[PDB]
Design a protein around this ligand. Structure first.
Ligand SMILES: *[C@@H]1O[C@H](CO)[C@@H](O[C@@H]2O[C@H](CO)[C@@H](O)[C@H](O)[C@H]2NC(C)=O)[C@H](O)[C@H]1NC(C)=O
Ligand SMILES: *[C@@H]1O[C@H](CO)[C@@H](O[C@@H]2O[C@H](CO)[C@@H](O)[C@H](O)[C@H]2NC(C)=O)[C@H](O)[C@H]1NC(C)=O
Ligand SMILES: [Fe+3]
Ligand SMILES: [Fe+3]
Length: 691
């Protein structure tokens, strides 16, 4: 009984009214049902929703943040759309509006009077206070940040502030008696228009609102030129140049619901129908995005032009963006705590084995490196977007996904280069050469060739990895044209695939026999080493790995049980011409050349990450002073934990600073094509956040 009715939570009485009208028009055109619940605040609606007593509520970014925390854990499911039909946007601008006449700039606001939309709201609080922080002389956490704002502005109106504790922040508010400084429309200086009115009336000298307000409340183009914008470059510009004069670019308000049983489908269904039937100029009888004369923004932003569905993988953190998300958090931290986080590198480990090795490295980094972890690589990418993690080394296939999500390459894993050979002094500056993706089979299976590989059993490092997937499948796909990847081979072990699929049939999970097909080291057949093992133990007939994998795991080079006796001569490669050669002849018998694995991070961490890694590798690197004695980064004994064990050093990119330039035009084209057959939820999430 999920769609019976969607229960919208209102925060005020006039809002309740509108919610009721909407209820009847939905019952007058025979659309999905909607019922209304009352409360007196966002927080209450947030609680109402988590306690199964309501289904949805529209919130500003600031409360999207609160709603995603601990008890509640709600998620955005639908964003508001603004702009025009020709150029829609699911974001808006936080600006600072002043009157034409004064001469003061953004850095000269000390002692002036301010007008805010409400405490903890995006444009009215979070952004302006985050931006002015260097001028506040705030000492940190015991002392609330409000207190410091109270001394900076001689007087303000900050709806919802504790007027008993911060009287200065309620001074200019126009509410009557108990409605003075109330977080509701009872306070006339509340929200975007309220804060703007506070400016027009001359009560305050500056207003912190959004870019559209001045245009929504002032019809006469003439009255608009009496106002200007404060730009962060300490200049003033017309209110129409907000694209070039804003404090921040922020995500649009969004409808939230619970993560578990939210009734997302029901919510989305109601909205879409509501939007079609009552959107901008659809029916005079009702305006979903319109509000009564003396009222503003009831249930939704007036003049919003529709909704855009938010992808499933997105949670509150991802929605807000790394900048804004971590900016909120920093408002509750001291400048020393913030600068310390800025100085440290948080690594993401994929799996307990990687976390273990990571912890060991951390305990020896003199405070420069710490750890975090997830069970998949994609989940680790998400933590880097949320700022909970900063870096990790990825196969080229994941560098694609990471790039489409806005991350960038910093350094690459350099491997024992072609015999220019000798422990290279300038390894860090030696251009990368990529590696060789090959197809490996047992020497005895004499009939097996590239032309007859289809239909047999296959072993892959993991889905979406270069040598293990993108290259093999890409070649096959280029022939048939089928998107049915699970029919290319009878059975396989392709970690990260659907467990009940054939692509998981040969996988064997951990020693206990659990985690079958999981994309991390617990699956014994995972990665370069795991896919080889899959072949050597006779599970599959061909393994898609790199040439050095076979070398590093035969002739006693790996003294583990399954591999102790394997010999290099018991294996051969399948060449694209139908022939077969020994592993030692991979330069003339490979499927393609793959880009070196690379370390990725957010743009704001590149410099710091780089100096740390360079330092760390000089200590624990290949010729690391303290390598054998204490710790070696590039060693883990064929498990390839955190980095490939054959990494000589982490080297510079020489200008290839974007994933497109680093991966190359051909390889990117290749993956893009493969992606038409299916995309990951993460890839879907990032397409949405980049729009
Ligand atoms: C914030 O800190 C500044 C300096 O730390 C204080 O500013 C002073 O700057 C003005 C302009 O020259 C002078 O009136 C004072 O003499 C300065 N400090 C000194 C030497 O006393 C500012 O008053 C502080 N703002 C607060 C606490 O809100
Ligand atoms: C599969 O790969 C081949 C190899 O590049 C692609 O090659 C070309 O297609 C064009 C159009 O027919 C020819 O003019 C070129 O001569 C071909 N290239 C080569 C190197 O011979 C082919 O287009 C690929 N894609 C698919 C899906 O067919
Ligand atoms: Fe807002
Ligand atoms: Fe790889």
């Amino acid at each position: 009984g999920r769609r019976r009715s969607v229960q919208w939570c209102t925060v005020s009485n006039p809002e309740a009214t509108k919610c009721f009208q909407w209820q009847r028009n939905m019952r007058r055109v025979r659309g999905p049902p909607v019922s209304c619940v009352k409360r007196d605040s966002p927080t209450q609606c947030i609680q109402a929703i988590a306690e199964n007593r309501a289904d949805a509520v529209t919130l500003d970014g600031g409360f999207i943040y609160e709603a995603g925390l601990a008890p509640y854990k709600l998620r955005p499911v639908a964003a508001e759309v603004y702009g025009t039909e020709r150029q829609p946007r699911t974001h808006y601008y936080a600006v600072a509006v002043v009157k034409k006449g004064g001469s003061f700039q953004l850095n000269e606001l000390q002692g002036l009077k301010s007008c805010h939309t409400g405490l903890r709201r995006t444009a009215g609080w979070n952004v302006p206070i985050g931006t002015l922080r260097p001028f506040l002389n705030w000492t940190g956490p015991p002392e609330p940040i409000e207190a410091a704002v109270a001394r900076f502005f001689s007087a303000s109106c900050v709806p919802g502030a504790d007027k008993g504790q911060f009287p200065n922040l309620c001074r200019l508010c126009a509410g009557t008696g108990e409605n003075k400084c109330a977080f509701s429309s009872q306070e006339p200086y509340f929200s975007y228009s309220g804060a703007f009115k506070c400016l027009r009336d001359g009560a305050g000298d500056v207003a912190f609102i959004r870019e559209s307000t001045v245009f929504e409340d002032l019809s006469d183009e003439a009255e608009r030129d009496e106002y200007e914008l404060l730009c962060p470059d300490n200049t003033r510009k017309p209110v129409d140049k907000f694209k070039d004069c804003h404090l921040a670019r922020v995500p649009s308000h969004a409808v939230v619901a619970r993560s578990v049983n939210g009734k997302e489908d029901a919510i989305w269904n109601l909205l879409r129908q509501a939007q079609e039937k009552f959107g901008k100029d659809k029916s005079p009888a009702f305006q979903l995005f319109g509000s009564p004369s003396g009222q503003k923004d009831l249930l939704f932003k007036d003049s919003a032009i529709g909704f855009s569905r938010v992808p499933p993988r997105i949670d509150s953190g991802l929605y807000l963006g790394s900048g804004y998300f971590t900016a909120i958090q920093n408002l509750r931290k001291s400048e020393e705590e913030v600068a310390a986080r800025r100085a440290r590198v948080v690594w993401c480990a994929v799996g307990e084995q990687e976390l273990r090795k990571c912890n060991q490295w951390s305990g020896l980094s003199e405070g420069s490196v710490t750890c975090s972890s997830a069970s998949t690589t994609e989940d680790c990418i998400a933590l880097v977007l949320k700022g909970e993690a900063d870096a990790m080394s990825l196969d080229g296939g994941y560098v694609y996904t990471a790039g489409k999500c806005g991350l960038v390459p910093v350094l690459a894993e350099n491997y024992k280069s072609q015999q220019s050979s000798d422990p290279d002094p300038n390894c860090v500056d030696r251009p990368v050469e990529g590696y060789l993706a090959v197809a490996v089979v047992r020497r005895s299976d004499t009939s097996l060739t590239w032309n007859s590989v289809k239909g047999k059993k296959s072993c892959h490092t993991a889905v979406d990895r270069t040598a293990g997937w993108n290259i093999p499948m890409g070649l096959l796909f280029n022939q048939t044209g089928s998107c049915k990847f699970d029919e290319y081979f009878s059975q396989s072990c392709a970690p990260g695939r659907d467990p009940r699929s054939n692509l998981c049939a040969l996988c064997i999970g951990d020693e206990q026999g659990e985690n079958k097909c999981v994309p991390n080291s617990n699956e014994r057949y995972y990665g370069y080493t795991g896919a080889f093992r899959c072949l050597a133990e006779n599970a599959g007939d061909v393994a898609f790995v790199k040439d050095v994998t076979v070398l590093q795991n035969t002739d006693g080079n790996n003294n583990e049980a399954w591999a102790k006796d394997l010999k290099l001569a018991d294996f051969a490669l399948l060449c694209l011409d139908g022939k077969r050669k020994p592993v030692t002849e991979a330069r003339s018998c490979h499927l393609a050349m793959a880009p070196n694995h690379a370390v990725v991070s957010r743009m704001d961490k590149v410099e710091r990450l780089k100096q740390v890694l360079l330092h760390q590798q000089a200590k624990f690197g290949r010729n690391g002073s303290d390598c054998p004695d204490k710790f070696c980064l590039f060693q883990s004994e064929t498990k390839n934990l955190l980095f490939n064990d054959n990494t000589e050093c982490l080297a510079r990119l020489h200008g290839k600073t974007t994933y497109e330039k680093y991966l190359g035009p051909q390889y990117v084209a290749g993956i893009t094509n493969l992606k038409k057959c299916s995309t990951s939820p993460l890839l879907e999430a990032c397409e949405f956040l980049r729009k």
